[PDB]
Amino acid sequence: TKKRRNNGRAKKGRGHVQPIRCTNCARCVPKDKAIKKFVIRNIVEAAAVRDISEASVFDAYVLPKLYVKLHYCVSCAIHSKVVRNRSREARKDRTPPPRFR
Amino acid sequence: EWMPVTKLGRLVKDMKIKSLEEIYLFSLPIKESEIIDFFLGASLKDEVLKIMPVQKQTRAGQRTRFKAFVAIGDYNGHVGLGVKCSKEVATAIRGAIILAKLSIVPVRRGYWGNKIGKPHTVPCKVTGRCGSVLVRLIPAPRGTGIVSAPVPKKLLMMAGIDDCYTSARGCTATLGNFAKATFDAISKTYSYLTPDLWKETVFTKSPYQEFTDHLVKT
Amino acid sequence: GRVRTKTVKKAARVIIEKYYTRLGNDFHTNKRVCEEIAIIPSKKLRNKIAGYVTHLMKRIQRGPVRGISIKLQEEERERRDNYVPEVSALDQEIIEVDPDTKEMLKLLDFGSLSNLQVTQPTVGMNFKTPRG
Amino acid sequence: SGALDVLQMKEEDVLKFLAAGTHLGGTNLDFQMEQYIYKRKSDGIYIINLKRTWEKLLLAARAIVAIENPADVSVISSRNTGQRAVLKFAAATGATPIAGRFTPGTFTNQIQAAFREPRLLVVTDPRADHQPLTEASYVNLPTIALCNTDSPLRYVDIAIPCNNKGAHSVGLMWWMLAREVLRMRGTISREHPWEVMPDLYFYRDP
Amino acid sequence: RAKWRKKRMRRLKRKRRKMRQRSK
Amino acid sequence: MQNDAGEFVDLYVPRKCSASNRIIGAKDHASIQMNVAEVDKVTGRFNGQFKTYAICGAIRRMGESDDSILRLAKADGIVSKN
Amino acid sequence: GKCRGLRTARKLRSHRRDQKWHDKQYKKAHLGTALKANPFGGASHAKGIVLEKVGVEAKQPNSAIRKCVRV
Amino acid sequence: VRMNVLADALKSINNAEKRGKRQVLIRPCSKVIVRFLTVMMKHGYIGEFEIIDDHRAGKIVVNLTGRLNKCGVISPRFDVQLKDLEKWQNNLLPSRQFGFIVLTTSAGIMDHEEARRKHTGGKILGFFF
RNA sequence: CAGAUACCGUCGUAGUUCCGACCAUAAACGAUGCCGACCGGCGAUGCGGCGGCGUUAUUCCCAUGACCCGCCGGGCAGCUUCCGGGAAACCAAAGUCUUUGGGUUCCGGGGGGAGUAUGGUUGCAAAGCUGAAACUUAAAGGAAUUGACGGAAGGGCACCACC
RNA sequence: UUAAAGUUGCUGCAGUUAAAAAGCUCGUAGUUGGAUCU
Ligand SMILES: [Zn+2]
């Protein structure tokens, strides 16, 4: 029986969507079906910042960041705990998780 | 000893309300069986249509419980149907009889052709629907009897209908839905608008408004 | 853990709602008023009711509780409720009214009101929340 | 008001409506509340027509007066802003108040403790007092409600267009209804103003 | 799986083409 | 509803909605019958008379029982013109 | 849906003819292969000569030997 | 495309009266529609109506009185002889005490009883009860 | 690895790319033919048009662009509803169906044998299209509900668990 | 062999998930076709 009204996708009013490769498997996934994450991290972690500024020759130097867009297939987002399963009604909640709090 | 708890029972028990059609006219929900026992009483007769065992799976085996279908009627234009599930059959039947009394509705009777005597058939073709079961009632000439299956025939005789053609579609082997689809069709006889009932309605005071002073002091 | 039970909590609530006048803040006096009135079995059950009574009377001084109802507290709250200032909040010398409300009052043949003062409406039509 | 000159609304009353912000609605409009508004003003606030508010209030007062037993009318408020105004409305006319949480099964379960069978129901908010108002569809109850511009009108038979959000507006709207009920019954003179002021009905933040 | 059985039934036909001919 | 002899052979005559002219059945528990009081032209007190309106559950589930009663009261003169 | 014109009789009749052959009772009766495979040839009874006595073991869950004859 | 404009006329009236409405708009108007509506009206089922001119196929506004259970069209216009009318009214009408079948005959558009009085058959347009 | 003709890894042929001819098949799916009418709301979005305070293209002339507030038409969708339907899941269409007829095309008739054999036809081939019967069988199947189990995810308790 | 069978469905069945809408569009025969005249 049918589970999702959108068939697990975002495809509406078009026939074909170009595929992409999963970051973890290298598996072909439609771009509208893949699980996408934008990660903006710091190059150095908080375990290394105190040892980096004390050696920096520039006063008030701001350390750079790192920008990566990651694509997952449905299997890796579940195995890596990126995406969980949830109840039938909760499945209809498409608000992003309250991380911004 | 009837100690009524609703204000309709306290008016039935005090001789203020002297007819069931007086309660039917205002669509008031009836919540006590002694009101039905008061007016119809010796006229009422009941019939057990089926006893259904049902089961609920548990860790330690099944859990059995019995369901009872009971029809009730006075053979003079009133009919009801009630269903009850309980751990014991006697309790199930005793509790289903109460529900059948509380479900009693009136039946409109009409004439197939010429209008001589008391009405004998349904006023018009009426359809009842219940979970894949369709039951159609067609008026029939006087003296034809009830041309129907044995399950809807009991409810059609309880209601005072003498002549009627019947048709049935869908899974009629489930008599729980087969009996609830013919009961639905009987209920619709006083819901179908006909040129007989085209006159403007005159509004009479409701019993709650009429016996305000009696209810206040009781 | 030291958590009371519905038996002791119900009995104490009933005692407080029925005998507010004699009960007080002292434990050893409430322990002696409970034995005089309520037919209670042994001391251990008597004390756990008379201790929660003493605990629960302090909360009443802080204000009402959602579990008991004293008619003396009803009277006190009615004295609080029967409060009206000498000058009401609805009699004002000047009432500020928008230009659009003034036309509605004009249609209501209330163009002779003297307490009114038409004000300048906001110009930027920005009353929506940004989307995203 | 059947176009009668004694039932027309006066300047001392329109000034009370204006001071309490009754004419001011919300940013949204229900499609069945559209006939009660005058116009939408920039900053996107709808204005309620006070003439229509007066007509609906008088109709509700008539409906209340037609009930012979004063206690058969039940008045309900869930939000605290209406809890002082329904205990004060019920003390002047004799109706039965319910302030606080409404227990499901009050009108349908016939063995409960606080079981009652009202003949008329008046609520402060259709959206907040939704359980008492849908439970009334099981036992043949008429309903009068105080409605804003975004209030649904299901099971609502007399909807009074008003600002049902502000404390001053709620207190004033409950005080006017009691005033009209008493003046229609004939216990209060229609020339002398009421010696009870609206402040007794208002909600105060502690 | 029906896909494999469809594949199996096709090899049988391809071989029966050879073993059942007009020249037989 | 009556035979050729003219006798009335109907068990009872049901009510009809004042709005949609629909028959109100015996198990329509969402139907209301409402009295609106009438006043004196001079003193404006309760005369002792009233006007009655019946509304059916289908109409008052639809959300149209507020406008229906207002229309019926305007028709009877209770509500002012506009 | 189905065509509903006044000049549709040929369409309706031809469609019914074609679709009756998907009824297995109709096809079995009207095709002729089930009449040639019937040993009795359309008769209700027939006479024959006994060749051997046989015993046929019953299908599960039953366990017995039904006693038949080859004719 | 739009074929049998009378079918659209009768489906619009049926759908509005299910919703408890007091007026219905019918477009386009046609004289078959007008005659059918008059036949319905003379029996007390709809009430007064009015035609709006557009220098085109006009339109109709019909007042509804809540007395209509069903009004429907029959397609195609089968020919009906006076000996085959009883079967049609058994199949289509809900009772022998009320309901009407509307036919078109050489004497006009009428119901199944006026046709019997005038001793004429015709073609079936529809029914209402 | 018990075994691996596999899953993992190192190479690697045809192929993957282009030009010119064949092939005509997909869970080619919204598993939902096309044309037309009627039937509830609400906020957005893409295009075209119409109207309206006010910001900005720096200080001005108008048009023109970027915002802001609405209206109309045609589109991709979304939320909500006792519109009504349905076995239900669910669907504003899958509604307007025993109160059964707007027009028209294709196609189904318990489960297998079987999309197989045979004949015809197209194709270089692989294959495509059309397409049985003998015989065998009392169920196969669709939705939803309580459990049991999961090498599925989250919580809690115990010195007959650990620390 | 007829009814039961509204399980051959003109009256009168079905085709999202139970059997089932052609991959898509064009196009002849066939079927159907908007107001409008006393
Ligand atoms: Zn992956």
Residue numbers in the entry:
A (entry chain a): 2 to 102
B (entry chain C): 59 to 276
C (entry chain R): 2 to 133
D (entry chain A): 2 to 207
E (entry chain h): 2 to 25
F (entry chain V): 1 to 82
G (entry chain X): 2 to 72
H (entry chain W): 2 to 130
Verbatim from the authors:
Nsp1 is a critical virulence factor of coronaviruses and plays key roles in suppressing host gene expression, which facilitates viral replication and immune evasion. It has been shown that Nsp1 effectively suppresses the translation of host mRNAs by directly binding to the 40S small ribosomal subunit. Here, we report a bipartite mechanism of SARS-CoV-2 Nsp1 which operates by: (1) hijacking the host ribosome via direct interaction of its C-terminal domain (CT) with the 40S ribosomal subunit and (2) specifically lifting this inhibition for SARS-CoV-2 via a direct interaction of its N-terminal domain (NT) with the 5’ untranslated region (5’ UTR) of SARS-CoV-2 mRNA. Upon infection, SARS-CoV-2 hijacks host cell translation machinery to synthesize ORF1a and ORF1b polyproteins that are subsequently proteolytically cleaved into 16 mature non-structural proteins, namely Nsp1 to Nsp16.
We determined the cryo-EM structure of the Nsp1–40S complex at a resolution of at least 2.9 Å for both the body and the head regions of the 40S. The Nsp1-CT could be traced in the cryo-EM map, which revealed a tight helical hairpin. However, the MBP tag and the N-terminal domain (Nsp1-NT) are invisible in the cryo-EM map, suggesting that they are flexibly linked to the CT. Nsp1 interacts with the 40S at the mRNA channel located at the interface between the head and body of the 40S. As such, Nsp1 binding blocks mRNA entry to the ribosome to inhibit protein translation, in agreement with recent structural studies. In more detail, Nsp1 forms interactions with three 40S protein subunits, uS3, uS5 and eS30, as well as the 18S rRNA. It is worth noting that three out of the four binding interfaces are between Nsp1 and the body of the 40S (uS5, eS30, 18S); only one interface, at the most proximal region of the Nsp1-CT, is with the head of the 40S (uS3). The Nsp1-uS3 interface has a buried surface area of 283 Å2 with mostly charge-charge interactions, and is mediated by Nsp1 residues, including D152, E155, E159 and D156. At the interface with the18S rRNA, Nsp1 residues H165 and K164 stack with the bases of U607, U630, and U631, while R171 and R175 form charge-charge interactions with the phosphate backbone of A604, G606 and U607. Overall, Nsp1 is highly buried, with close to 60% of its total surface area of 2,400 Å2 interacting with the 40S.
